[PDB]
Amino acid sequence: SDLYLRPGDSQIQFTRHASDVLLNLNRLRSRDILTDVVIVVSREQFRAHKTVLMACSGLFYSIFTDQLKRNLSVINLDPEINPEGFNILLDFMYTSRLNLREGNIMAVMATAMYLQMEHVVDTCRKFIK
Amino acid sequence: DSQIQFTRHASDVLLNLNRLRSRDILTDVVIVVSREQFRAHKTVLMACSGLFYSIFTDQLKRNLSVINLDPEINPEGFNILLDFMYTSRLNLREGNIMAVMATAMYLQMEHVVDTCRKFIKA
């Protein structure tokens, strides 16, 4: 008898793999491990990973797709950008959770507009209904 | 007061992360396996492999761009596990299922090992 390993071609889909990757990406961020860029927003600094910023922000995609800034390590945003709004959206990029409260939803939305996070803006538009 | 949860966000981030690898964008390490090489992101490799998490946290071994795996590691087995880290999809081919399982032990990916053990039959 043949103890052969199964019929053959097979594929396994790990449903929660995407979530566990992102959670671990945050743990790396929260411990400042392999953070490769510091975002300067109105003299207040935020460290993050360039790849996560590109995946989420259409703006950070445009920025680090460009040769000048692709391999650099500092980005100064428009000084009008609210630092609180950016910090709320950076936590969304890593946790899938958007922590908007009443009073800062207008700042969170207009900052998502600056970062070219198109789908996050629309979810705020419907959240005024 | 409120909070919104985007259920497929993590899935969208991983897809975009694989698109960056696909276009070779901000890849910061090459993994040499026997003859062949594999470009990837150190952050994705640390998120998924207990072994890669171990080097890239070591102080001296943080600023290195070429990792050489042991010559015994099968490139075809590593490539299957690498595509897994970016896609949640582990493709066990006709003749690789033992290699993929073995490489996963080397990479300290204990959960993928445990899943294949429940899968292997004979």
């Binding site: 789908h119 996050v120 959240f127 | 409120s2 919104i4 949860q5 985007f6 969208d12 276009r23």
Partner: peptide, 16 residues
């Protein structure tokens, strides 16, 4: 707190 789930796409899709 109010927790509202969103089943749609959360970020843009980096082209191939």
């Amino acid at each position: 707190i109010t927790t509202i789930k969103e089943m749609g796409r959360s970020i843009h899709e980096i082209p191939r």
